[PDB]
Write an enzyme that holds these catalytic residues in place. Structure first.
Site, mmCIF file in Angstrom:
data_model
loop_
_atom_site.group_PDB
_atom_site.id
_atom_site.type_symbol
_atom_site.label_atom_id
_atom_site.label_comp_id
_atom_site.label_asym_id
_atom_site.label_seq_id
_atom_site.Cartn_x
_atom_site.Cartn_y
_atom_site.Cartn_z
ATOM 1 N N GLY A 1 0.793 -1.228 0.000
ATOM 2 C CA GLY A 1 0.000 0.000 0.000
ATOM 3 C C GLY A 1 0.827 1.279 0.000
ATOM 4 O O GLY A 1 0.275 2.376 0.088
ATOM 5 N N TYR B 1 -7.615 0.823 -10.205
ATOM 6 C CA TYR B 1 -8.989 0.865 -9.688
ATOM 7 C C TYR B 1 -9.909 0.853 -10.881
ATOM 8 O O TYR B 1 -9.927 1.807 -11.639
ATOM 9 C CB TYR B 1 -9.245 2.143 -8.806
ATOM 10 C CG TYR B 1 -8.362 2.199 -7.574
ATOM 11 C CD1 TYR B 1 -7.036 2.626 -7.660
ATOM 12 C CD2 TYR B 1 -8.806 1.703 -6.353
ATOM 13 C CE1 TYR B 1 -6.185 2.570 -6.562
ATOM 14 C CE2 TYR B 1 -7.964 1.654 -5.243
ATOM 15 C CZ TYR B 1 -6.658 2.102 -5.350
ATOM 16 O OH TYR B 1 -5.817 2.045 -4.270
ATOM 17 N N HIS C 1 -10.821 10.279 3.760
ATOM 18 C CA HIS C 1 -9.559 9.831 4.303
ATOM 19 C C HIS C 1 -8.400 10.695 3.869
ATOM 20 O O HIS C 1 -8.506 11.479 2.956
ATOM 21 C CB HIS C 1 -9.273 8.408 3.830
ATOM 22 C CG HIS C 1 -8.952 8.317 2.374
ATOM 23 N ND1 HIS C 1 -9.918 8.387 1.402
ATOM 24 C CD2 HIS C 1 -7.776 8.178 1.722
ATOM 25 C CE1 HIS C 1 -9.356 8.291 0.216
ATOM 26 N NE2 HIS C 1 -8.056 8.163 0.380
ATOM 27 N N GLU D 1 -4.090 10.090 3.202
ATOM 28 C CA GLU D 1 -3.270 8.947 2.811
ATOM 29 C C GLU D 1 -2.635 8.271 4.027
ATOM 30 O O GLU D 1 -2.600 8.857 5.112
ATOM 31 C CB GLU D 1 -2.182 9.411 1.832
ATOM 32 C CG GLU D 1 -2.730 9.937 0.538
ATOM 33 C CD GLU D 1 -3.701 8.956 -0.090
ATOM 34 O OE1 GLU D 1 -3.285 7.833 -0.452
ATOM 35 O OE2 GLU D 1 -4.903 9.284 -0.143
ATOM 36 N N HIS E 1 -9.935 13.620 1.487
ATOM 37 C CA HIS E 1 -10.677 13.555 0.238
ATOM 38 C C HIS E 1 -11.629 12.359 0.238
ATOM 39 O O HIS E 1 -11.439 11.398 0.998
ATOM 40 C CB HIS E 1 -9.727 13.499 -0.985
ATOM 41 C CG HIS E 1 -8.660 12.458 -0.888
ATOM 42 N ND1 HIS E 1 -7.534 12.653 -0.109
ATOM 43 C CD2 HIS E 1 -8.563 11.259 -1.507
ATOM 44 C CE1 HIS E 1 -6.798 11.557 -0.252
ATOM 45 N NE2 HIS E 1 -7.365 10.700 -1.104
ATOM 46 N N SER F 1 -2.868 4.680 -9.226
ATOM 47 C CA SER F 1 -2.476 5.477 -8.073
ATOM 48 C C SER F 1 -1.293 4.918 -7.303
ATOM 49 O O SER F 1 -1.057 3.709 -7.317
ATOM 50 C CB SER F 1 -3.662 5.567 -7.113
ATOM 51 O OG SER F 1 -3.337 6.397 -6.015
HETATM 52 C C1 5U8 Z 1 -5.485 0.013 0.655
HETATM 53 N N1 5U8 Z 1 -6.629 0.444 -0.148
HETATM 54 C C2 5U8 Z 1 -6.356 1.739 -0.777
HETATM 55 C C3 5U8 Z 1 -6.472 2.897 0.199
HETATM 56 C C4 5U8 Z 1 -6.633 4.223 -0.502
HETATM 57 C C5 5U8 Z 1 -5.860 5.395 -0.376
HETATM 58 N N2 5U8 Z 1 -6.280 6.364 -1.171
HETATM 59 N N3 5U8 Z 1 -7.344 5.825 -1.830
HETATM 60 C C6 5U8 Z 1 -8.023 6.576 -2.818
HETATM 61 N N4 5U8 Z 1 -7.682 7.868 -2.818
HETATM 62 C C7 5U8 Z 1 -8.171 8.609 -3.822
HETATM 63 C C8 5U8 Z 1 -8.983 8.117 -4.822
HETATM 64 C C9 5U8 Z 1 -9.338 6.770 -4.780
HETATM 65 C C10 5U8 Z 1 -10.219 6.191 -5.798
HETATM 66 O O1 5U8 Z 1 -10.630 6.818 -6.769
HETATM 67 N N5 5U8 Z 1 -10.521 4.882 -5.604
HETATM 68 C C11 5U8 Z 1 -10.042 4.160 -4.566
HETATM 69 N N6 5U8 Z 1 -9.233 4.616 -3.637
HETATM 70 C C12 5U8 Z 1 -8.875 5.943 -3.749
HETATM 71 C C13 5U8 Z 1 -7.585 4.554 -1.451
HETATM 72 C C14 5U8 Z 1 -7.863 0.409 0.642
HETATM 73 C C15 5U8 Z 1 -9.119 0.834 -0.083
HETATM 74 C C16 5U8 Z 1 -9.083 1.194 -1.421
HETATM 75 C C17 5U8 Z 1 -10.224 1.614 -2.080
HETATM 76 C C18 5U8 Z 1 -11.393 1.664 -1.378
HETATM 77 F F1 5U8 Z 1 -12.514 2.100 -2.012
HETATM 78 C C19 5U8 Z 1 -11.483 1.310 -0.063
HETATM 79 C C20 5U8 Z 1 -10.334 0.891 0.582
HETATM 80 ZN ZN ZN Z 2 -6.642 8.678 -1.120
#
Ligand code: 5U8
Ligand code: ZN
Ligand code: ZN
Length: 343
Positions: free
Chosen positions: A161, A168, A179, A181, A267, A279
Site C-alpha cells: 500500500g 482501480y 480519508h 493517505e 478527500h 495510483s
Molecule cells: C489500501 N486500499 C487503498 C487505500 C486508498 C488510499 N487512497 N485511496 C483513494 N484515494 C483517492 C482516490 C481513490 C479512488 O478513486 N478509488 C479508490 N481509492 C482511492 C484509497 C484500501 C481501499 C481502497 C479503495 C477503497 F474504495 C477502499 C479501501
Molecule cells: Zn486517497
C-alpha cells in the site's frame, strides 16, 4: 479562496521533472486546497492502447454495501470472487449498474447521494499493477523516485500500500470514503480511461474540524479507534459538511488527467461510470513532519518507521524526537523547502 482546488497545465519541458513540478505547484499555493489537478501536455500518453487488457485479473473485487441516512453513511466492502476486466465491464455497462441519464454534474451528484445505499456496485479496487508502458519516463506512477524510496533503500522491505502502483476499475456509484493517505503522505492518481471520477476535498488547515465532526457523528467508532477515518468506511455528504461549516471544494477528474492529494488532505469521491485509474503515494521533504505526527489506526494497517527520515533530514532533532521533546507545530500554508527556487 486560497483553499480552492487549482488546475495546472505544464508544458512538455515542465512535465519531465516530477518533483520539481510538485515543488512548483506548492509555490503557487496548490497544497492549501489539499487536492490539485494536473493536465499533462497533449502529446503525452502513458500507453498506446487499452484494447489489450480484457483478460487482466481483478483478484479481489469488492461489492460496496452502504448503510445510513441523513447524509451519514458507513461503507462495508464485501469481497467477491476474482474476475477479469472483460467480466467487470459487462456488469458496469449493464442496465442494472450503468450511469443514469444526466444533464449537469449537480444532477448526477444528487443521484449519487440519493442512491448510494441502493443496488451495491462492484469496485475493481487495489489491483497491484500498472498500465504504463515500460519506456514512459514522465510522471510514471510505477517509479516516481521521491524520498519515500528511502524505506526500501535501507531495509529492502516494500510496505504493501506504499510505493507500489494500484489500479482501480470503477463503475457508477463506486466510492472512496473520507480519508487522508497512509502516514499522511502525498498521493497521485491518473485516470487512464472511461467515465469521470468526482472528488471532494477539505483543506489540511481544516482537517481537524472534519475529524471532530466525524467523532461527534460516530462516537462508537471513535472510542474503538481514534483514527477510525483511516478504515476508509465513512461517507459524509457535502450537505452535511456545509451544515456544520466544514470548508470543502469539489472537482471532476476526466480521462487523461492527474489528481495530486497533499499531506493531511482529506478527500472522498465517486466514479461516474466504467473507468480505470492508477495510483500511488509519494513524499517530499515537507511530509517528514506529517509522518512524525500522523495519528494512526490503533485497532488493526500501514505504518512506516520515521527514524530513517528524521536521522537523514532532521539529525539535530533526532535525540529530541526520540525523547518525546519534538514540540514542532505544522503550518499547513507553508510550501515544501524544494519550492524556494520559485519564490
Ligand atoms: C489500501 N486500499 C487503498 C487505500 C486508498 C488510499 N487512497 N485511496 C483513494 N484515494 C483517492 C482516490 C481513490 C479512488 O478513486 N478509488 C479508490 N481509492 C482511492 C484509497 C484500501 C481501499 C481502497 C479503495 C477503497 F474504495 C477502499 C479501501
Ligand atoms: Zn486517497
Ligand atoms: Zn482503527
Amino acid at each position: 479562496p486560497s483553499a480552492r482546488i487549482m488546475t495546472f497545465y505544464p508544458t512538455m519541458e515542465e512535465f519531465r521533472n516530477f518533483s520539481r513540478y510538485i515543488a512548483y505547484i506548492e509555490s503557487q499555493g496548490a497544497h492549501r486546497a489539499g487536492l490539485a489537478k494536473v493536465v499533462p501536455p497533449k502529446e503525452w500518453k502513458p500507453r498506446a492502447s487499452y484494447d489489450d487488457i480484457d483478460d487482466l485479473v481483478i483478484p479481489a473485487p469488492i461489492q460496496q454495501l452502504v448503510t445510513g441516512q441523513s447524509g451519514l453513511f458507513t461503507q462495508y466492502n464485501i469481497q467477491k470472487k476474482a474476475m477479469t476486466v472483460r467480466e467487470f465491464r459487462k456488469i458496469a455497462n449493464s442496465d442494472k449498474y450503468c450511469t443514469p441519464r444526466y444533464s449537469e454534474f449537480e444532477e448526477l451528484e444528487r443521484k449519487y447521494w440519493k442512491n448510494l445505499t441502493f443496488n451495491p456496485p462492484i469496485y475493481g479496487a487495489d489491483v497491484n499493477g500498472t498500465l504504463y508502458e515500460k519506456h514512459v519516463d514522465e510522471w510514471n506512477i510505477g517509479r516516481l523516485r521521491t524520498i519515500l524510496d528511502l524505506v526500501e533503500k535501507e531495509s529492502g522491505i516494500t510496505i504493501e500500500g506504499v510505493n507500489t502502483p494500484y489500479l482501480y476499475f470503477g463503475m457508477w456509484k463506486t466510492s472512496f470514503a473520507w480519508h487522508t493517505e497512509d502516514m499522511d503522505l502525498y498521493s497521485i492518481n491518473y485516470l487512464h480511461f472511461g467515465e469521470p471520477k468526482s472528488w471532494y476535498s477539505v483543506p489540511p488547515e481544516h482537517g481537524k474540524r472534519l475529524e471532530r465532526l466525524a467523532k461527534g457523528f460516530f462516537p462508537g467508532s471513535a472510542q474503538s479507534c481514534e483514527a477510525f477515518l483511516r478504515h476508509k468506511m465513512t461517507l459524509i455528504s457535502p450537505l452535511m459538511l456545509k451544515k456544520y461549516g466544514i470548508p470543502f471544494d469539489k472537482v471532476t477528474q476526466e480521462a487523461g488527467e492527474f489528481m495530486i492529494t497533499f499531506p493531511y488532505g482529506y478527500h472522498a469521491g465517486f466514479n461516474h461510470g466504467f473507468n480505470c485509474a492508477e495510483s500511488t503515494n509519494f513524499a517530499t521533504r515537507r511530509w517528514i513532519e506529517y509522518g512524525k505526527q500522523a495519528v494512526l489506526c490503533s485497532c488493526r494497517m500501514v505504518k512506516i518507521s520515521m527514524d530513517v527520515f528524521v536521522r537523514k533530514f532532521q539529525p539535530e532533532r533526532y535525540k529530541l524526537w526520540k525523547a518525546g521533546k519534538d514540540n514542532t507545530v505544522i503550518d499547513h500554508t507553508l510550501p515544501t523547502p524544494e519550492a524556494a527556487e520559485f519564490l
